[PDB]
Design a protein around this ligand. Structure first.
Ligand code: ZN
Ligand code: ZN
Lengths: 413, 45, 48, 56, 114, 106, 136, 98, 61
RNA sequence: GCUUGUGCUGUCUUCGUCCA
């Protein structure tokens, strides 16, 4: 449901008829794992059979696709792939079986599950440790560099927990060197850094006093005001919202020659979206973005004035662990986007012939099936062609030399 | 000519290198060869 | 080629009396017989 | 057969690229020559350098 | 004259689509302001359009899927204009009766035949 | 199935030439009022260099191919085969000189 | 992972004021409130708010794996419902000064006897201990 | 063919459980077809049409065949698994730890 | 025998099969899958019948 | 009259062993 609508339009003129073709994705249906033989029959699969015959313990996934034919003058379950099933989970066949049928199924009652069976080989996903998102971290740059402190934040949307953008606020100028200690802010899809006053005005707060009101929270602290003074002096050249947005729009890495109004619209787009996306995405909600910018600049100043130590990178409460869930979610997002692009390409090719496509031919379940199977079998957590420069060892063969080693391998990070 | 045993119902049968590898009675896809007839001796040590 | 290669044999004399084996190498009288339980192969004259 | 100078330049640059990546596939500032599997091509230079190279 | 890279085997398809759009938009408020377009079998992957403005080229390529994502357009040199339309292997004049030729395949593969 | 008219250089389907004739060469070949004989001799299905012309008058390509006085459509740079001598003599009777587009004559 | 919408509803119910109604000159003593790293509002009586949030979490109203952090030194109050946070359980010591049980564990021999039996005296397992406020 | 023995195989090309196996001995017999040479010049029963692709036992190992599994793969061809069992008695050079 | 003939013989003996532990476990698993399908479809009538059938088949020793 | 056959992949990845 992240991208639930594929859209194809065709302003046919061959009596102008504007036709829109669009397909919607509905419900997801899952089943218990099944095994399909060469003679064509099917039967319920159990993990011992998959281990003995070098099968993959996986279940089919069905998706409801609804097709509509929009025209202006001026659909059932499709199999999208097979997902490997983790043993002893809610979707495993061994979850229900009691102690006696577990013995009849040749399963050990001491076995705990938590692994997958790909081609008869037991694979365990290793938890990946990453830094937390949506937190401001202030660091000190080393001596052979004009930058003395940096304040970086990585933003991730709550739905899906996926990284979107990274924004930094560098503090140029060394102690007693480089004249003024200007504060430049790095922005996404912008080729060169930007002083904080210009972007602050671009968000829609012009007066310098209110910029200081947003940044600082105690007027008697003359030192932070002194450190902000060079930024005010540098940004004094810009004094209006619209010229500030235009200045944003010139450096926005877009195609050369864009007109001024379109540049301003592009700046408005790149400012509303992709600038601190975790805060908000709608228009006219930039007050919170200005307050958060003031908070980041305040943290940068507090660290720069030796009032606080730089953030501990190795602190464990600032780290996160990715279990089977998030890793499989990222992998499935990539594979589903690939499948959607394939469906789009096939639809574009088919509209040339102008036929009432079954829609059970556009979908290639082999994409998701092979991608998941390859990633779990080899441990390379990405597309097969993208194996170079990709994370490796995320999936390993389960250790079975002794029971304690199996437990340790199942609880590793 | 060669004896087998089903992996599910432990039924014995034979194959002639032309039948599908399946159990006759319960249709399991997993079968095992029977133990040889040669003499088996151990040194009890 | 001797007619005794790859044939089940029993030892009748010496320190391995009454042990079942299989003849693997037979050049001149010194038959090489693998022992069913000890994972080893031993030389032995054909007389035994 | 027929010589549009742009097409000559394109195909001759392709020939130069092939001859260059046949001997050195670690050229800085340009993409490597890749195999159909996506792995980079093993050039003659890479056979002679490193711990696993010819010399060492 | 501008040349634009396209996908292999779709050059004639792009030529026919350009002609169809030119005919359809003729007599309208915003006709396709081009003059001619063509391609050559030997010069694979190239489609040459004769116009006067780059915006006309962009309008002509608009709505086509065989054109690659990047605007891979270049200005053809004026001297190359005659070379782009020069003929090739045209002097030849069909097969001549009485000549001796060899057979490519079949039961008489390689036998000389008159 | 498409054929390239030898005289004017236009490319149209062979059945279009049989049913409707060549829209430009009809004044001197009478292709619309002729049998498959004249269609086969004056149009060839083997060609190279598909050309689409939008504006005959101002296109330098049209002047270079001598097609600036003809109907816009599909054109061929090179056409295999030449017009027969009797058709050439008939065109010379009409006062029109025929320059072959086969490339062998230059 | 847990949704943050009930957390925001509880915070807005208990006197949190949004950012648009915030003046840094006027609010020289208010506490900034963060939810999943997003500054969502301010409050002037953080003690009552943190007590109410902690009591709600200990009663099962809020999910037990939600983080409730009060930074007194920096005047911040942070809440995390993110996925991937590593946690461990601990006994809760009755810290209420007004209570007689101050300085003593909340878990008693009655809880141990109920755990050994397996049911409450009008299933009693680990989750029953967690939602009774003796473990968090 | 290989240098090991083939007399321990059965008619179906598989060894039976309970048989002693030494290094290099053949436990799975498999052949692949090969387009015959000019041996159709006359070789009544001794013209080669197959190439050997058998599986020998590891040269450093020996033991008893414990269990032989026969089934079919996902595609539909035959599929075999042979398990060998042996006993390892402690000796000089074996590693122990507290 | 062919694959179809073997499957027909297996189905015939399954019809003749009074009881077999492996087949009872497979049937109970299939019934559990049908039960979760009925529960997810909010069918309050089918699930009672499947529960009654499972209760009749179950209670092993 | 009947004679004994003569050998082996590559490239990555992961987990380990003994020092350091
Ligand atoms: Zn059976
Ligand atoms: Zn004509």
């Amino acid at each position: 449901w992240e991208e639930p609508r594929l859209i194809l339009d065709q302003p046919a003129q061959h009596d102008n008829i504007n036709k829109r073709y669009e397909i919607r994705f509905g419900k997801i249906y899952l089943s218990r794992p099944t095994m399909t033989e060469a003679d064509g029959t099917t039967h319920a699969m159990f993990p011992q059979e998959a281990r003995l015959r070098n099968l993959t313990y996986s279940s089919p996934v069905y998706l409801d696709m609804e097709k509509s034919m929009f025209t202006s003058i001026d659909g059932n379950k499709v199999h999208i792939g097979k997902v490997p099933i983790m043993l002893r989970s809610k979707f495993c066949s061994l979850r229900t079986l009691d102690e006696v049928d577990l013995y009849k199924m040749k399963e050990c009652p001491y076995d705990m599950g938590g692994y997958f069976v790909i081609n008869g080989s037991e694979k365990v996903l290793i938890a990946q440790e990453r830094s937390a998102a949506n937190i401001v971290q202030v660091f000190k740059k080393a001596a052979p560099s004009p930058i003395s402190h940096v304040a970086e934040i990585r933003s991730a949307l709550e739905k899906g927990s996926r990284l979107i953008s990274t924004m930094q606020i560098k503090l140029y100028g060394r102690e007693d060197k480089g004249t003024g200690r200007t504060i430049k802010a790095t922005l996404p899809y912008v080729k060169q850094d930007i002083p904080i006053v210009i972007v602050f005005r671009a968000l829609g707060v012009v007066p310098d006093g209110e910029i200081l009101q947003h940044i600082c929270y105690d007027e008697n602290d003359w030192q932070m005001l002194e450190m902000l003074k060079p930024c005010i002096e540098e940004g004094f050249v810009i004094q209006d919202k619209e010229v500030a947005l235009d200045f944003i729009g010139r450096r926005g890495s877009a195609a050369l020659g864009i007109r001024r109004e379109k540049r301003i619209q592009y700046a408005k787009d790149i400012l509303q979206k992709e600038l601190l996306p975790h805060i908000t995405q709608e228009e006219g909600f930039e007050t919170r973005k200005t307050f958060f910018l003031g908070y980041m600049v305040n943290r940068l100043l507090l660290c720069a004035l030796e009032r606080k130590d730089q953030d501990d990178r190795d602190h464990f409460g600032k780290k996160r662990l990715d279990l089977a869930g998030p890793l499989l979610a990222n992998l499935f997002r990539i594979l589903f986007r690939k499948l959607t692009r394939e469906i789009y390409r096939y639809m574009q090719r088919c509209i040339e012939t102008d036929r009432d496509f079954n829609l059970n031919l556009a979908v290639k379940s082999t994409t998701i099936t092979s991608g998941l199977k390859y990633s779990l079998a080899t441990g390379n957590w990405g597309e097969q062609k993208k194996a170079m420069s990709s994370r490796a060892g995320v999936s390993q063969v389960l250790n079975r030399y002794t029971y304690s080693s199996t437990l340790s391998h199942l609880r590793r990070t | 000519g060669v004896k087998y045993t089903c992996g599910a119902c432990a039924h014995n049968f034979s194959l002639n290198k032309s039948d599908p590898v399946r159990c006759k009675e319960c249709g399991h896809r997993v079968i095992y060869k029977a133990r040889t007839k040669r003499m088996i001796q151990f040194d009890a040590r | 080629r001797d007619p005794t290669l790859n044939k089940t044999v029993k030892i009748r004399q010496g320190g391995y009396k009454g042990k079942i084996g299989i003849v693997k190498e037979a050049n001149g009288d010194r038959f090489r017989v693998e022992l069913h339980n000890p994972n080893k192969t031993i030389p032995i004259p054909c007389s035994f | 057969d027929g010589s549009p100078q742009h097409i000559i330049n394109e195909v001759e640059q392709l020939l130069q690229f092939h001859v260059a990546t046949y001997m050195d596939n670690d050229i800085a500032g340009q993409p490597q020559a890749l195999q159909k599997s996506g792995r980079p091509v093993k050039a003659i230079r890479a056979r002679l350098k490193g711990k696993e190279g010819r010399l060492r | 004259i501008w040349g634009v890279k396209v996908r292999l085997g779709k050059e004639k398809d792009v030529v026919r689509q350009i002609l169809k759009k030119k005919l359809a938009r003729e007599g309208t408020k915003n006709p396709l302001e081009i003059y001619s377009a063509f391609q050559r079998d030997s010069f694979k992957g190239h489609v040459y359009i004769e116009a006067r403005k780059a915006e006309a080229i962009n309008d002509a390529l608009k709505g086509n899927v065989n054109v690659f994502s990047n605007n891979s357009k270049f200005l053809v040199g004026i001297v190359e204009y005659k070379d782009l339309l020069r003929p090739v292997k045209s002097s030849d004049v069909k097969l001549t009766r009485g000549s001796y030729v060899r057979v490519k395949n079949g039961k008489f593969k390689g036998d000389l035949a008159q | 199935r498409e054929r390239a008219c030898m005289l004017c250089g236009i490319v149209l389907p062979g059945r279009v030439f049989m049913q409707n004739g060549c829209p430009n060469c009809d004044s001197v070949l009478n292709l619309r009022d002729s049998d498959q004989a004249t269609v086969n001799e004056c149009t060839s299905s083997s060609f190279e260099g598909l050309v689409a012309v939008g504006d005959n008058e101002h296109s330098w390509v049209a002047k270079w191919l001598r097609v600036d006085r003809f109907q816009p459509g599909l054109y061929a740079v090179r056409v295999d085969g030449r017009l027969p001598s009797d058709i050439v003599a008939a065109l010379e009777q009409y006062g029109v000189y025929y320059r072959p587009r086969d490339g062998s004559v230059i | 992972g847990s949704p943050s919408e009930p957390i925001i509803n509880f915070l807005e119910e208990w006197g949190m004021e949004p950012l648009e109604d915030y003046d840094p000159a006027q609010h020289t003593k208010s506490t900034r409130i963060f939810v999943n790293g997003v500054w969502t509002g301010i409050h002037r009586d953080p003690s009552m708010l943190v007590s109410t949030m902690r009591d709600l979490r200990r009663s099962g109203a809020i999910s037990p794996e939600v983080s409730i952090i009060r930074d007194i030194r920096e005047r911040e109050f942070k809440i995390f419902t993110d996925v991937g946070r590593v946690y461990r359980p601990l006994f809760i010591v009755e810290d209420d000064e007004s209570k007689d049980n101050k300085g003593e564990l909340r878990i008693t021999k009655e809880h141990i006897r109920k755990i050994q039996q397996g049911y409450d005296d009008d299933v009693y397992g680990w989750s029953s201990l967690v939602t009774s406020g003796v473990i968090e | 063919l290989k240098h090991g023995t083939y007399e321990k195989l059965d008619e179906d090309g598989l060894i039976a459980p309970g048989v002693r196996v030494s290094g290099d001995d053949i436990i799975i017999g498999k052949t692949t077809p090969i387009p015959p040479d000019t041996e159709e010049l006359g070789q009544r029963t001794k013209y080669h049409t197959k190439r050997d692709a058998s599986t020998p036992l590891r040269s450093t190992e020996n033991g008893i065949v414990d269990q032989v599994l026969l089934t079919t793969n996902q595609e539909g061809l035959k599929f075999v698994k042979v398990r060998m069992r042996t006993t390892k008695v402690p000796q000089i050079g074996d590693k122990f730890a507290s | 025998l062919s694959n179809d003939e073997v499957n027909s013989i297996v189905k015939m003996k399954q019809s003749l099969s009074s009881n077999t532990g492996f087949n009872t476990v497979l049937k109970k698993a299939q019934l559990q899958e049908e039960l979760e399908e009925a529960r997810d479809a909010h069918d309050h009538e089918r699930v009672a019948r499947i529960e009654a059938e499972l209760k009749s088949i179950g209670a092993e020793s």
